[PDB]
Amino acid sequence: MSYYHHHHHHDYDIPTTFQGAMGSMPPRPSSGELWGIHLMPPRILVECLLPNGMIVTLECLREATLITIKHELFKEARKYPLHQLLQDESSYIFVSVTQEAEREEFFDETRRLCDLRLFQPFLKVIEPVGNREEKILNREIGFAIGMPVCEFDMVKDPEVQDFRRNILNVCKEAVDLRDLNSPHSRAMYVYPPNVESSPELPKHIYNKLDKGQIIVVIWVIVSPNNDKQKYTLKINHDCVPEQVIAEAIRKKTRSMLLSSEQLKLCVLEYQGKYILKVCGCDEYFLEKYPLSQYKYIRSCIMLGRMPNLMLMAKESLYSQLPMDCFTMPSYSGETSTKSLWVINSALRIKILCATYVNVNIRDIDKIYVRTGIYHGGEPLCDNVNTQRVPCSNPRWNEWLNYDIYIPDLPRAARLCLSICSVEEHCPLAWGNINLFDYTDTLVSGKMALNLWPVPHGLEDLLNPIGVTGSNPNKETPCLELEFDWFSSVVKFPDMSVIEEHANWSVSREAGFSYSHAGLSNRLARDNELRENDKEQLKAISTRDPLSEITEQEKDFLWSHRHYCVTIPEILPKLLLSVKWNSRDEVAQMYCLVKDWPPIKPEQAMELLDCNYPDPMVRGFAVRCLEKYLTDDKLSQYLIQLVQVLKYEQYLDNLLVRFLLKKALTNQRIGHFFFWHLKSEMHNKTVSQRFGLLLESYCRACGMYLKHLNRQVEAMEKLINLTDILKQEKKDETQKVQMKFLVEQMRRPDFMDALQGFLSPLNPAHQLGNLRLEECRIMSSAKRPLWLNWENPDIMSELLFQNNEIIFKNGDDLRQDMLTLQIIRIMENIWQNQGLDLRMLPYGCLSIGDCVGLIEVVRNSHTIMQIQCKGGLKGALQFNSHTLHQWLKDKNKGEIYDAAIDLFTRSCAGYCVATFILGIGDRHNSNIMVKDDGQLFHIDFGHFLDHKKKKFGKRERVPFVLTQDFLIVISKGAQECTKTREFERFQEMCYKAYLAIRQHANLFINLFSMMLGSGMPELQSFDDIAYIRKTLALDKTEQEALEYFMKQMNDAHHGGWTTK
Amino acid sequence: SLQDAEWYWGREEVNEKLRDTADGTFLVRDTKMHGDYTLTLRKNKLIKIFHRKYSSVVELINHYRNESLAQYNPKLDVKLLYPVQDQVVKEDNIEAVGKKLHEYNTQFQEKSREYDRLYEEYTRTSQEIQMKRTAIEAFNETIKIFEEQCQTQERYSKEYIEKFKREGNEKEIQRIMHNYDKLKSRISEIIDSRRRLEEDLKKQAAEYREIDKRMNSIKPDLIQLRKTRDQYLMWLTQGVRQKKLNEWL
Ligand SMILES: COc1ccc(N)cc1F
């Protein structure tokens, strides 16, 4: 007791006191097959309501089809009365109330009772009501989306209905590209060519080619199927599929009964009939790119593999393509107005009352409404109201007066308000509104605003980055209010009007005279500027987004705005230097942006974050994408572009139309476009928006809807199974759990639902039959499922006979998702700029609320295992060499030398990325090494040093190289730190660090665009400021290098020299 | 004095000191081949100080503590009003200020878990509530289909009583009335299922309010507990000991 000074804690108790003890797995909840029960009983009674009014309950097996149930119902209805009042069973269809509270008519009678999502186990019989049975396969769409389509139809809002009708413009326009040169262009939508951005090849790839040649293998089939024939080529790396197809045919059809010329004529008739498949997955080579430019080839080179392609007949392909067959749905500014520039008054806003406010009167003294106008940043002095009727029934009936003229409101203006407590200053709730509506109409009259709760990381009072609009959830502070009505609906000026007032503002400046102190605004330079300024302006240009601009530099920029056209890349900085509270300036800015030079997408993506909310700007930004952003480079950045939709003011905008169209032009984009939208559907910030967009996609995507509907059904199966495992089958043995898993998966509803479908991680890979013996639950507390499928390709053997991917209910995958994305982008940055560090950014996909998929990498082990398996007899200590010993056991000969090179190449890459991103501390169980010698990290945790939110200038080193790694880096030598093996390794790290330092603008912007997603690690820009220190962007590169050397020296305690 | 200067500290760590101060609060910062010093006035407005005059750095700032910045540059109608080691129990101990930093940081970190716990309960409860609301619309819809059924059978059954009648007058109509009796007390069960949900909904929304209520009482303490813990860490760094800190924290 003398340990604790006998000081008791009376409050503490252990009669079940928390989710600390056995602490994992918090995603709950979501209900399964029936209301209030995850998995319906294996034999169940179901009420069958008939047309004659008779209720017969008949026991069904849970897995029984509706054809089985109807057939039995109309046998069992004979024994009940009024049998002559029934028609033949064929004159009838089932219907019932589902868990979504809609009465879903059950048209596909092959479906099983468990799969219907029934709420209460009962069925009603009726004759099929709507003459278009076809039209009521919006069930397909609403199953894919997860909310029923009818739910939109009874939305009142004119914008939503205007989105739904107008967006079809895009859908029809996409389908019209698909069926243009059909069947080729259809095959192109379905199987778009999987191709790198560059035809140009890295020198280290080129040097594996012996003067630009690869050995390929073309495979063919003849009779009946199943017997296959190699035809090993040795073609040029930069020859096209058509040329490779000829050679395979040439060599297939040379012969002793065929002259040279006779062969040439047999080649021409045969050559055009085929196209190249990748053996083992639905990938193809459908247009003229260099073979090397297709991803599969370029990877086959890197891994030291011989590409295995198949010669596929075009008609056996145009067999497997369907008709995409678009169909318009059922659902197929009125009068003149007073321009905003006429309104001669200030802005004022009447704050009436908040109703549902939950505060302790014993704790809090007084509460008030803070307010402010914004554009990302604020166009005036931020004001409050008085601290009236504190806590109890808070009612202020005040007009707040904002020092801004109504004409000087920008198109993208937004009121950001918040109820606060009292220096005891402290926000309760918040909510923002666009001061104009989607039809450009200045908002007047009465408005009710249901508010949002303050999130974790926000200490600030107001939160203007937060989503524009009322909360859907009713039971929350409903602060209602009134806007000044000016005897006419006030609309925003036309562009033709802004052009004229701008062209006037210019010529008015031309007569402003000799001396103008605070020159800042205007140049006084004429057509001839000074060389020192034109040098300073490019210096500003180069500075990253987060290097905030001074009021001097702003004005300096805004004056020379017309020279700023010669340096397009300045535009982000220029725009932030406009006075948006001066329409004179904003009108002129609209004229520059109108015909500003297009810029590179990686620079134009800055213009779609929350600091650039203006339509004209964001237009130019999408104009940049429409020109440059390739279908490859788009899907690289798709996660960031979907997130950036949140910062658009209105549903209907140019960016949504861009992405939607692309997704309908390319099914590989479509596939991930669906899943990132679908992922966030649980979040009420965007449920409405993303549903609408997902409706548009689903209605226009052709037969992939039916593929997605299988994927979706397979995930929902797994979401239940795990949700049962994590609730009722916790406090059981693995033994007991696994016996439950295998039972369930063998039932026919699971066997139907989890077998023939496409991997959401990569829909190229098919998933065939489940191999249940290699299926299992992992040891993690979250109860992830290790799942395994037979690759049902013709050429399984050539690629992988078994696909296998981990499904993890209860862990938020989107942090990992993003870092693995950043790693993939760092790798391309290094490698395409000629230096071969090898990251393994394994696949990860979040498909819902803390539910997702992780690519298994076969033949890789945690350092911990390496050491567990290599631990000697009596448990004394683990050897540092055992990693090295284990790696040698796998690689012997010249193979050993190359394995170390790889290990050292992968160790240098992952050290620099890890340090830069500040990911979670690395250790034995989250670092992995492969049999061939490549190393890579898993389970990243928190990216931008989220553990610095407690205490935190820590500039942490997460990958700290114990001796283990250095032994392996420098073969076997005592005092590893001092070999040339390690000198090299260091110079890999320095060249790597400087590469990511010269692409810092990108990585800033990627993180800037991800603020939208409510990731606790990305709450606001100074989260992303960590990446500045770690990269050292305020310093010169020579100091930066030394900074990194310094940073690395102290973590490793010696070993980092001048060089 | 010019090195001390109170407000003179000598980008990222500037924002965290300007974070959650009022309109008018400021400080001065230090590439040299760029400019010299940087006034960071919050309204975060950065204003350059060029040196070739600035007569001194302290000269320029005391003028604008009295007077606004509107006459210098049009849209800066705000003064240098708040020129932000005061309390911290005035402990000139060094070690004992360091122990207090652990004490408050354990209390802060304790408090952030309680705040994080309740933000999950809140959002689970907002989910669980609306799941119940939809279920009630499902029940209410379920009930319409059963209320329609007991109606639907009366139309057809009371046609099949009057026509004929004598043909199994009770043999027919018993087993028609039995079905009708099962139908209506089934409705009685469904309704009593629904009623019982709505009582839970109000008991849930009650707890929902009680979570939010205690979130708003944990917040203001969490802000000041953090703010006191930062000045306790400022006071220390005014001996360097950047590395010694971590065991307390
Ligand atoms: C077309 O095959 C199907 C696949 C999955 C479901 N649910 C229904 C089907 F008819």
Side-chain angles (χ1 to χ4, degrees), chain A residues 774-804:
Chain A
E774 297 283 4
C775 280
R776 49 189 205 284
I777 309 162
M778 298 288 91
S779 51
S780 168
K782 317 263 172 161
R783 323 311 305 147
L785 297 177
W786 187 278
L787 293 160
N788 190 272
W789 286 278
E790 291 173 37
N791 188 233
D793 205 75
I794 292 155
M795 307 286 210
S796 332
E797 284 80 43
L798 282 287
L799 202 67
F800 45 89
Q801 274 211 299
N802 274 28
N803 199 317
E804 49 186 332

Short mmCIF file of all heavy atoms in Angstrom, two decimals, chain A residues 774-804:
data_model
loop_
_atom_site.label_atom_id
_atom_site.label_comp_id
_atom_site.label_asym_id
_atom_site.label_seq_id
_atom_site.Cartn_x
_atom_site.Cartn_y
_atom_site.Cartn_z
N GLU A 774 -8.79 -22.36 -47.21
CA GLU A 774 -7.86 -21.23 -47.12
C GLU A 774 -8.55 -19.90 -46.71
O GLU A 774 -7.86 -18.90 -46.52
CB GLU A 774 -7.09 -21.09 -48.45
CG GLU A 774 -6.21 -22.30 -48.80
CD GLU A 774 -4.90 -22.37 -48.01
OE1 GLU A 774 -4.66 -21.54 -47.10
OE2 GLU A 774 -4.08 -23.28 -48.31
N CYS A 775 -9.88 -19.89 -46.59
CA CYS A 775 -10.62 -18.78 -45.94
C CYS A 775 -10.60 -18.92 -44.43
O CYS A 775 -10.85 -20.01 -43.91
CB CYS A 775 -12.09 -18.72 -46.36
SG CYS A 775 -12.42 -17.95 -47.95
N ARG A 776 -10.37 -17.81 -43.73
CA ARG A 776 -10.32 -17.82 -42.26
C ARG A 776 -10.36 -16.42 -41.64
O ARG A 776 -10.14 -15.41 -42.31
CB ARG A 776 -9.07 -18.58 -41.78
CG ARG A 776 -7.78 -18.15 -42.45
CD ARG A 776 -6.61 -19.06 -42.12
NE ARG A 776 -5.37 -18.30 -42.27
CZ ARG A 776 -4.78 -17.98 -43.43
NH1 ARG A 776 -5.29 -18.37 -44.60
NH2 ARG A 776 -3.66 -17.25 -43.42
N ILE A 777 -10.64 -16.39 -40.33
CA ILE A 777 -10.60 -15.17 -39.53
C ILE A 777 -9.20 -14.99 -38.99
O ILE A 777 -8.61 -15.93 -38.45
CB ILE A 777 -11.55 -15.21 -38.30
CG1 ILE A 777 -12.98 -15.63 -38.71
CG2 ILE A 777 -11.62 -13.85 -37.64
CD1 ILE A 777 -13.83 -16.10 -37.55
N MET A 778 -8.66 -13.79 -39.09
CA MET A 778 -7.36 -13.50 -38.52
C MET A 778 -7.40 -13.33 -36.99
O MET A 778 -8.47 -13.27 -36.35
CB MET A 778 -6.75 -12.27 -39.20
CG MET A 778 -6.51 -12.46 -40.68
SD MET A 778 -5.14 -13.58 -41.07
CE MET A 778 -5.96 -15.17 -41.19
N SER A 779 -6.21 -13.29 -36.41
CA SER A 779 -6.04 -13.17 -34.97
C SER A 779 -6.38 -11.79 -34.43
O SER A 779 -6.56 -11.65 -33.23
CB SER A 779 -4.61 -13.54 -34.58
OG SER A 779 -3.67 -12.81 -35.35
N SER A 780 -6.44 -10.77 -35.29
CA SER A 780 -6.76 -9.42 -34.83
C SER A 780 -8.09 -9.39 -34.08
O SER A 780 -9.00 -10.17 -34.36
CB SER A 780 -6.82 -8.43 -35.99
OG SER A 780 -7.40 -7.19 -35.60
N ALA A 781 -8.19 -8.47 -33.12
CA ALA A 781 -9.42 -8.27 -32.35
C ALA A 781 -10.60 -7.78 -33.19
O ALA A 781 -11.75 -8.02 -32.84
CB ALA A 781 -9.16 -7.31 -31.21
N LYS A 782 -10.29 -7.12 -34.31
CA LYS A 782 -11.31 -6.54 -35.19
C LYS A 782 -12.05 -7.63 -35.98
O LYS A 782 -13.05 -7.33 -36.64
CB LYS A 782 -10.69 -5.54 -36.19
CG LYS A 782 -9.65 -4.57 -35.65
CD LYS A 782 -10.18 -3.19 -35.28
CE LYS A 782 -9.08 -2.40 -34.58
NZ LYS A 782 -9.26 -0.92 -34.53
N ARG A 783 -11.54 -8.87 -35.93
CA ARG A 783 -12.10 -10.01 -36.65
C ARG A 783 -12.14 -9.69 -38.15
O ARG A 783 -13.22 -9.59 -38.75
CB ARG A 783 -13.50 -10.42 -36.11
CG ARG A 783 -13.73 -10.31 -34.60
CD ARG A 783 -12.64 -10.95 -33.75
NE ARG A 783 -12.40 -12.35 -34.09
CZ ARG A 783 -11.22 -12.97 -34.03
NH1 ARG A 783 -10.11 -12.35 -33.64
NH2 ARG A 783 -11.15 -14.25 -34.39
N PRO A 784 -10.96 -9.44 -38.75
CA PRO A 784 -10.91 -9.36 -40.20
C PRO A 784 -10.99 -10.75 -40.81
O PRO A 784 -10.63 -11.73 -40.16
CB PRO A 784 -9.55 -8.71 -40.50
CG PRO A 784 -8.73 -8.94 -39.30
CD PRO A 784 -9.66 -9.13 -38.13
N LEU A 785 -11.47 -10.82 -42.05
CA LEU A 785 -11.62 -12.07 -42.75
C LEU A 785 -10.55 -12.15 -43.82
O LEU A 785 -10.45 -11.28 -44.68
CB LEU A 785 -12.99 -12.17 -43.39
CG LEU A 785 -14.18 -12.17 -42.42
CD1 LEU A 785 -15.47 -12.20 -43.21
CD2 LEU A 785 -14.13 -13.34 -41.45
N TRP A 786 -9.75 -13.21 -43.72
CA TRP A 786 -8.83 -13.62 -44.78
C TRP A 786 -9.63 -14.44 -45.80
O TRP A 786 -9.96 -15.61 -45.55
CB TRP A 786 -7.69 -14.45 -44.18
CG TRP A 786 -6.61 -14.78 -45.13
CD1 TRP A 786 -6.61 -15.80 -46.03
CD2 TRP A 786 -5.36 -14.10 -45.28
NE1 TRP A 786 -5.43 -15.80 -46.74
CE2 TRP A 786 -4.65 -14.77 -46.30
CE3 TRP A 786 -4.77 -12.99 -44.65
CZ2 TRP A 786 -3.37 -14.36 -46.71
CZ3 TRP A 786 -3.50 -12.58 -45.07
CH2 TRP A 786 -2.82 -13.27 -46.08
N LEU A 787 -9.95 -13.82 -46.94
CA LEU A 787 -10.81 -14.44 -47.96
C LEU A 787 -10.02 -14.83 -49.20
O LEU A 787 -9.06 -14.15 -49.56
CB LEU A 787 -11.92 -13.47 -48.34
CG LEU A 787 -12.93 -13.20 -47.23
CD1 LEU A 787 -13.69 -11.90 -47.52
CD2 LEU A 787 -13.89 -14.37 -47.05
N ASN A 788 -10.46 -15.90 -49.85
CA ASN A 788 -9.71 -16.57 -50.92
C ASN A 788 -10.64 -17.06 -52.03
O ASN A 788 -11.64 -17.74 -51.76
CB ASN A 788 -8.94 -17.76 -50.33
CG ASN A 788 -7.94 -18.37 -51.31
OD1 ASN A 788 -8.27 -19.27 -52.09
ND2 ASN A 788 -6.69 -17.91 -51.23
N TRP A 789 -10.29 -16.75 -53.27
CA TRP A 789 -11.10 -17.08 -54.44
C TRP A 789 -10.24 -17.76 -55.51
O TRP A 789 -9.05 -17.43 -55.66
CB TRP A 789 -11.72 -15.81 -55.01
CG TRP A 789 -12.84 -15.26 -54.20
CD1 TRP A 789 -14.14 -15.68 -54.22
CD2 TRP A 789 -12.78 -14.20 -53.26
NE1 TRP A 789 -14.89 -14.95 -53.34
CE2 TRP A 789 -14.07 -14.03 -52.73
CE3 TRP A 789 -11.75 -13.38 -52.80
CZ2 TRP A 789 -14.37 -13.07 -51.77
CZ3 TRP A 789 -12.05 -12.42 -51.84
CH2 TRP A 789 -13.35 -12.27 -51.33
N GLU A 790 -10.84 -18.68 -56.25
CA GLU A 790 -10.18 -19.26 -57.42
C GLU A 790 -10.24 -18.22 -58.53
O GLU A 790 -11.31 -17.72 -58.83
CB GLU A 790 -10.87 -20.56 -57.85
CG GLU A 790 -10.65 -21.70 -56.86
CD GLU A 790 -11.45 -22.97 -57.15
OE1 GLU A 790 -11.62 -23.31 -58.34
OE2 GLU A 790 -11.91 -23.63 -56.18
N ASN A 791 -9.09 -17.88 -59.11
CA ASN A 791 -9.07 -17.05 -60.32
C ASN A 791 -9.68 -17.88 -61.46
O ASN A 791 -9.08 -18.86 -61.89
CB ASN A 791 -7.65 -16.61 -60.69
CG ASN A 791 -7.62 -15.60 -61.83
OD1 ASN A 791 -6.91 -15.80 -62.82
ND2 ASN A 791 -8.36 -14.50 -61.69
N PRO A 792 -10.87 -17.51 -61.93
CA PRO A 792 -11.52 -18.34 -62.93
C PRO A 792 -11.09 -18.02 -64.37
O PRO A 792 -11.74 -18.49 -65.32
CB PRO A 792 -13.00 -18.03 -62.70
CG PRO A 792 -12.98 -16.57 -62.34
CD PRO A 792 -11.64 -16.27 -61.72
N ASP A 793 -10.02 -17.25 -64.56
CA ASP A 793 -9.49 -16.99 -65.89
C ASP A 793 -9.17 -18.30 -66.63
O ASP A 793 -9.03 -19.36 -66.01
CB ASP A 793 -8.23 -16.12 -65.80
CG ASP A 793 -8.00 -15.33 -67.06
OD1 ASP A 793 -8.73 -14.33 -67.25
OD2 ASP A 793 -7.10 -15.70 -67.85
N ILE A 794 -9.07 -18.22 -67.95
CA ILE A 794 -8.57 -19.33 -68.77
C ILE A 794 -7.13 -19.65 -68.33
O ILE A 794 -6.78 -20.83 -68.14
CB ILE A 794 -8.61 -18.98 -70.28
CG1 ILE A 794 -10.07 -18.89 -70.78
CG2 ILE A 794 -7.85 -20.01 -71.12
CD1 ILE A 794 -10.25 -18.02 -72.02
N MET A 795 -6.34 -18.58 -68.15
CA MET A 795 -4.92 -18.66 -67.79
C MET A 795 -4.63 -18.31 -66.32
O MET A 795 -3.66 -17.61 -66.03
CB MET A 795 -4.12 -17.70 -68.68
CG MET A 795 -4.34 -17.89 -70.17
SD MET A 795 -3.53 -19.36 -70.83
CE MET A 795 -3.20 -18.79 -72.49
N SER A 796 -5.47 -18.81 -65.41
CA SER A 796 -5.19 -18.74 -63.97
C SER A 796 -3.74 -19.01 -63.74
O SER A 796 -3.02 -18.19 -63.18
CB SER A 796 -5.98 -19.77 -63.15
OG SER A 796 -7.23 -20.14 -63.74
N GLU A 797 -3.30 -20.16 -64.25
CA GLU A 797 -1.98 -20.71 -64.02
C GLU A 797 -0.88 -19.69 -64.26
O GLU A 797 0.03 -19.55 -63.45
CB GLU A 797 -1.75 -21.94 -64.90
CG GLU A 797 -2.46 -23.22 -64.43
CD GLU A 797 -3.94 -23.31 -64.79
OE1 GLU A 797 -4.31 -22.97 -65.94
OE2 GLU A 797 -4.73 -23.73 -63.92
N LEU A 798 -0.98 -18.95 -65.35
CA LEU A 798 0.07 -18.00 -65.74
C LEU A 798 0.21 -16.77 -64.81
O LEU A 798 1.28 -16.17 -64.77
CB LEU A 798 -0.14 -17.53 -67.19
CG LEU A 798 0.27 -18.44 -68.36
CD1 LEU A 798 1.78 -18.49 -68.51
CD2 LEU A 798 -0.30 -19.86 -68.25
N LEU A 799 -0.86 -16.39 -64.09
CA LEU A 799 -0.85 -15.16 -63.26
C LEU A 799 -0.96 -15.45 -61.76
O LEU A 799 -0.02 -15.18 -61.01
CB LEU A 799 -1.94 -14.19 -63.70
CG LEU A 799 -1.69 -12.73 -63.31
CD1 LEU A 799 -0.49 -12.16 -64.06
CD2 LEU A 799 -2.94 -11.90 -63.57
N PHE A 800 -2.10 -15.97 -61.32
CA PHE A 800 -2.21 -16.52 -59.97
C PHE A 800 -3.44 -17.37 -59.92
O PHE A 800 -4.51 -16.92 -60.31
CB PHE A 800 -2.26 -15.43 -58.88
CG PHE A 800 -3.18 -14.27 -59.18
CD1 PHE A 800 -4.53 -14.30 -58.82
CD2 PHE A 800 -2.69 -13.12 -59.78
CE1 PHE A 800 -5.37 -13.22 -59.10
CE2 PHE A 800 -3.52 -12.04 -60.05
CZ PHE A 800 -4.86 -12.10 -59.71
N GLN A 801 -3.29 -18.62 -59.48
CA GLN A 801 -4.43 -19.54 -59.36
C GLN A 801 -5.36 -19.12 -58.22
O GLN A 801 -6.54 -19.46 -58.24
CB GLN A 801 -3.98 -21.01 -59.19
CG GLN A 801 -3.70 -21.75 -60.50
CD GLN A 801 -4.01 -23.24 -60.39
OE1 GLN A 801 -3.41 -23.96 -59.58
NE2 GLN A 801 -4.96 -23.71 -61.20
N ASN A 802 -4.82 -18.39 -57.24
CA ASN A 802 -5.60 -17.90 -56.11
C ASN A 802 -5.44 -16.40 -55.88
O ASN A 802 -4.34 -15.91 -55.62
CB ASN A 802 -5.22 -18.67 -54.86
CG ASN A 802 -6.00 -19.96 -54.69
OD1 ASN A 802 -6.45 -20.57 -55.66
ND2 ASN A 802 -6.18 -20.37 -53.45
N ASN A 803 -6.57 -15.70 -56.01
CA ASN A 803 -6.73 -14.32 -55.55
C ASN A 803 -7.15 -14.38 -54.10
O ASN A 803 -7.93 -15.25 -53.71
CB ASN A 803 -7.82 -13.61 -56.35
CG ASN A 803 -7.73 -12.09 -56.26
OD1 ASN A 803 -7.52 -11.51 -55.19
ND2 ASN A 803 -7.93 -11.44 -57.40
N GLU A 804 -6.65 -13.45 -53.29
CA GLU A 804 -7.04 -13.39 -51.89
C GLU A 804 -6.82 -12.00 -51.31
O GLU A 804 -5.76 -11.39 -51.52
CB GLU A 804 -6.31 -14.45 -51.07
CG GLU A 804 -4.80 -14.52 -51.27
CD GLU A 804 -4.16 -15.69 -50.54
OE1 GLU A 804 -4.70 -16.14 -49.50
OE2 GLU A 804 -3.11 -16.17 -51.01
#
